[PDB]
Amino acid sequence: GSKINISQVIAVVGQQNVEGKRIPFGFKHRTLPHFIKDDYGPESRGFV
Amino acid sequence: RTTSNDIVEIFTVLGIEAVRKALERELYHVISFDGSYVNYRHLALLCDT
Amino acid sequence: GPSSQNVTEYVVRVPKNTTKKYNIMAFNAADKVNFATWNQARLERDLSNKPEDQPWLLRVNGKSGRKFKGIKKGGVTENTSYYIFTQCPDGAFEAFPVHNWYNFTPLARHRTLTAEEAEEEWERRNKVLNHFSIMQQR
Amino acid sequence: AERGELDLTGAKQNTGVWLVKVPKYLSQQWAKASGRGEVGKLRIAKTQGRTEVSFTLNEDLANEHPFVLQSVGGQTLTVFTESSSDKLSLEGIVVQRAECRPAASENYMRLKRLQIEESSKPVRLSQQLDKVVTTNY
Amino acid sequence: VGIRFCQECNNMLYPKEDKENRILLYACRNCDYQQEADNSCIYVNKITHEVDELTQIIADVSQDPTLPRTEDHPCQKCGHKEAVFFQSHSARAEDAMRLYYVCTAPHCGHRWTE
Amino acid sequence: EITPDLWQEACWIVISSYFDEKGLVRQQLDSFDEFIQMSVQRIVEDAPPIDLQPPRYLLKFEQIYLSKPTHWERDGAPSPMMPNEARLRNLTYSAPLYVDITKTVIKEGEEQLQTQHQKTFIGKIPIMLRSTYCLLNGLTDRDLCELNECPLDPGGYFIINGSEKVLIAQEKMATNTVYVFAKKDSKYAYTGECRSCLENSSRPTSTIWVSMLARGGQGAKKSAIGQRIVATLPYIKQEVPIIIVFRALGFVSDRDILEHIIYDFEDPEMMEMVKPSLDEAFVIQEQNVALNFIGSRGAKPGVTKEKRIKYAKEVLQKEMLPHVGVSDFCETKKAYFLGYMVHRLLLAALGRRELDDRDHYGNKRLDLAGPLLAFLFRGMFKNLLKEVRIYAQKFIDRGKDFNLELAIKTRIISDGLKYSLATGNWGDQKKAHQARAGVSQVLNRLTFASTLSHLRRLNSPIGLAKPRQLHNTLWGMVCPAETPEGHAVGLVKNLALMAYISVGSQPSPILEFLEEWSMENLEEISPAAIADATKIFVNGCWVGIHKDPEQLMNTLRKLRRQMDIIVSEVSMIRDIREREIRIYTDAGRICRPLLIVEKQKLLLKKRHIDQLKEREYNNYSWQDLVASGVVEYIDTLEEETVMLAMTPDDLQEKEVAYCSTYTHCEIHPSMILGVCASIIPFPDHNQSPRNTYQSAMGKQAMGVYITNFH
Amino acid sequence: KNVTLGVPRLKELINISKKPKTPSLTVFLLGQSARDAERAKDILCRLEHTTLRKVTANTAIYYDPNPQSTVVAEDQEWVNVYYEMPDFDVARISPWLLRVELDRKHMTDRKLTMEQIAEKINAGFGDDLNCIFNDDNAEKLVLRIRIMNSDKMDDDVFLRCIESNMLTDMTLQGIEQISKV
Ligand SMILES: [Zn+2]
Ligand SMILES: [Zn+2]
């Protein structure tokens, strides 16, 4: 284990990335249909 | 002290001994980036050969 | 006036069958066609196939005027019916179904490049010089 | 004067005709009438700044059809003829387009399901046999 | 800045210079149809590409369900304190994160960009 | 009314109703039922009559007769076959296929005496269990247990030589849809993909490749010409320009050509970008020389110029975009669709749109048991017709008589179906090099969960990590957790719990409604008013435009939510930024059920939950719920343009404003997982690699698997 | 900014790839310029390869047979400032005129000047392409280009070809195959 695993277990999993960048825009410039269009916020782009 | 990343151009400009030293430095940089260490003897062997 | 509250009531009549078949034209407004030129007309068959299921031909003023070629629409009138309402002195509208709809396009009247000599300017695929004077050699 | 010549007297008179598209039930009723001489009445009402065109179905034919005008300057149309005597003639220039819509909003689809069922009546499906056929060979 | 086509054969028009009167002469070289052009411009290319996107945006984008919907920043021609904001999201046409406001009234459609 | 703080019971009640009505393997059974009902009939009907001569002989086909799966013993006894007997005796589970042969004789003497060879046996077609054309359909628990067949078994698997075989759905690129792509290293910069085919009856997918030329050869006059537009056409050995193809359809005036290409005449830069093609096409000004040019570069050049004319007309008529029309007069539809073809390419070239993503799994469809068996039956029915024709010609060259009883060979169709469903080589036996493998794997029976996973499985035709990645498009389409650990990561995936696959429908009622509802037809249009209106697409092909978008969409949605002439499977798309209406009807689409949010309240009221709570003795089920306009089948295509709510009581209500125009609500958030991933509890508390590992290992967990194991 | 590393870089080094994936070239300054930010910015601008595409705002082609015709609404000033001396005007001036303008932001940011690019145009080509020099007092840095005098393909083909030729590579300053520093 590592202290980063301790942080992910207890406090916050953290920012999550795909091929370096954040979660892309598979739909019409939105990550998921639940989130509003044209959003670059934390929750809408992959942060846990 | 000016160096590069490409090998064919540094062969065409400086010489094969510069290829030796630059190839040494680039292989050491790409292996020892993540903290994993490897002995110099194998690197020197591969760079000479 | 009377036109501010004008109400018109006419009668719709459909005769059962007519000895003369009716159809419809198709002209683009961007073609800028005039009807003062319409002094003598011809409408004959295409001869490229060599008849009812074959595309059309039309001539204007012989060879002096412009030329059209007619092609039948691809859709079938199994679920469509088009009627033409004609004004008559008796005041009752006439409703007549059309048989076919044909599409017409204008044709140029010049020395078009024939196919047997069209292969010589293909070696100049990118090497082509002076696009603006290809017609000058013809 | 030739067989292939097209008569152009209709265009010289500047005759104005209309183009109407109607749904299939109206055309089917007019075909069932078999040209009796009267199929309905067309009503045109003009206000101070608007035009209201509608069609009324005959009460004998049944046992409101509002008309919406469409822009004409997008493309020009005339009407020609082909006779049984092989004499081609031109009727006149189309000057207005008409679109027919039914007054029914939700009760139209009661008849539309029946029409789709009639259209899918010759749609052909495989049948299952309880007992295998033993009359072969 | 703009082009038009030939008249009597209905073909595409090509430029030509005139030897006598020294005026640009658009002409169809499938014909002999010659005329002058009042624009006096043949070719323009905005390489940095600062086109005006206000004519690019369809006036009916505001009635989209899944677009955002703000309450402030009212429209200009009508008050109508409700509007939609989004970005262009057009590839190769700049990199700006600047917002494109459209009024959401059914008969309005005046769009502004602040 | 409204149900606050009672969603936990209501959501699982309606999921109970869905799983009690449909089940888990409906994407197999419905597809096979559609194959048996429509597809074999359409294949046998859309076949060329056999004409041969001398007297003229004509053969035509008719409807399909099918019986229960029986056995042909050594004495000829037609005993009813049970699936247990099929498993024990290494016996294939099949029923004979019966047609009639209408033999009409023409001796040029008005001697037409047509003979109807009624109920002619032509071969054996396999049937998989628990389908409506099998013995296990309609049997209750007691009849299944008396028959030594497991009631818990979902079925959906064939029996070939006693081995249980299941068809895994294979994805393919979506038909009749124009795409844009940008190859990084190729000489073409951008390209357009419109792999297209007719309505799944006549001929397979024939592609068209419209593309770009990158800025090369700069400094010379090549850059002065600009970026010309080029395409490569099927069975044309090399590339060909665009306006010459447009003139090959009979439209010679380039004002009409650019009218088809450009819809708005106040766009100077796009006309500048399409201008390089106009300078290139200055050598061709007439239709016939264009046909002679395009026919001279085919696979087989003609002897005379009329031969190139005929070859080019045939290849531009019978094959060039078969879905839009092949009725010999459809050049106007082809011209409009070929204008829109590279209109999308120009829109991607100027950056007004973006490049379409290949692994976006809403831009591709799935080949189920239905389409794959239809393709196989098409191929070897063509083979059977060829065999019948050559035998008939050889035996009629003597001129004695003709007999249909021995001419038709059941052997070839029987071994074709059996072999291709057994060994996995999908296609002809002698053409196994070009035959796609991996189809029809041996059914896994280690675990009931493993069985339900193997029934509901997808696969990719890929032999680069781009297609393997989990995509945004999947939300409740395909399970994120389940993935094989080995070399097939991303390629092999299983369905979600509510992943319903489209079975297919005919678009004739769709066209019948759209023509009547104040829509101007495609041929009878003013071409200058295309840009102001909204385009209409039904199964990809352009059928006209409409000037009133939201009234049309609201009318279509109101028709679908009331189970009117439109099937609830059929989906419609509104892309406002492009002004198109895309309506999809064909099979292969994948869908999930979703709730309806009107204004700011759900339509799933307390009365529906009360009726579904006492489901039995009240004949109210999932099909009655969808008929009330409460649940609408929203697929991955409509998910591009709608909104979803995670939980009504937590998100749909009023708080600090995030949104107020929700259109759909999630039926329950835990239907994301598949069959394997559902049995993991608290999967959010785990790590996703561990969920993937256990979903892979959940199939290896032993136990009781099927109740009649002894 | 970052360079490639790991398994693809190891493959790139064990092989001898004639094109690298992400080649880089670390530059060390020798003397006074190592510690001065302004001299380092000068070396930055002197090593930045600047094509004419990046610096010019837009291009235009017009037709002016008369030098005093002045079809542009605001060009009359520098035309009258320069055209009182008829430098081979009477032979020909090629009425098909090229007009480009320079974006002031990209003009100032790259820290070059506008006379030297015209000098490089008339030096790298010679006397086969006439150049017209304007002033920086105007709000738009307009540049006017005309064809030579002593001489198929009309005029539009040659003019558009040479316009594209300036627009793709002139090497205004810097060294080739260097994208960003
Ligand atoms: Zn012309
Ligand atoms: Zn407003």
Automatic annotation (TrEMBL), chain B:
Domain of life: Eukaryota
Cellular compartment(s): Chromosome; Cytoplasm; Nucleus
Function: DNA-dependent RNA polymerase catalyzes the transcription of DNA into RNA using the four ribonucleoside triphosphates as substrates.
Family according to the record: Belongs to the RNA polymerase beta' chain family.
Protein name: DNA-directed RNA polymerase subunit
Source organism: Sus scrofa
Automatic annotation (TrEMBL), chain F:
EC number: 2.7.7.6
Keyword terms, alphabetized: DNA-directed RNA polymerase, Hydrolase, Magnesium, Metal-binding, Methylation, Nucleotidyltransferase, Nucleus, Phosphoprotein, Transcription, Transferase, Zinc, Zinc-finger
Superkingdom: Eukaryota
GO CC aspect terms: chromosome, telomeric region; RNA polymerase II, core complex
Predominant place of localization: nucleus
Domain named RNA polymerase beta subunit protrusion: residues: 23-414
Cofactor(s) this protein requires: Mg(2+)
A biological process from GO: transcription by RNA polymerase II
Domain RNA polymerase Rpb2: 174-367, 441-501, 536-598, 622-669
Record carries keyword Transmembrane helix: no
An annotated Gene Ontology molecular function: ribonucleoside binding
Location within or outside the cell: Nucleus
Catalysis: reaction(s): a 3'-end ribonucleotidyl-ribonucleotide-RNA + H2O = a 3'-end ribonucleotide-RNA + a ribonucleoside 5'-phosphate + H(+); RNA(n) + a ribonucleoside 5'-triphosphate = RNA(n+1) + diphosphate
Protein family per UniProt: Belongs to the RNA polymerase beta chain family.
Function: RNA-dependent RNA polymerase that catalyzes the extension of a non-coding RNA (ncRNA) at the 3'-end using the four ribonucleoside triphosphates as substrates. An internal ncRNA sequence near the 3'-end serves as a template in a single-round Pol II-mediated RNA polymerization reaction. May decrease the stability of ncRNAs that repress Pol II-mediated gene transcription.
Record-given protein name: DNA-directed RNA polymerase subunit beta
Positions spanned in the full protein: 142 to 867 of 1300
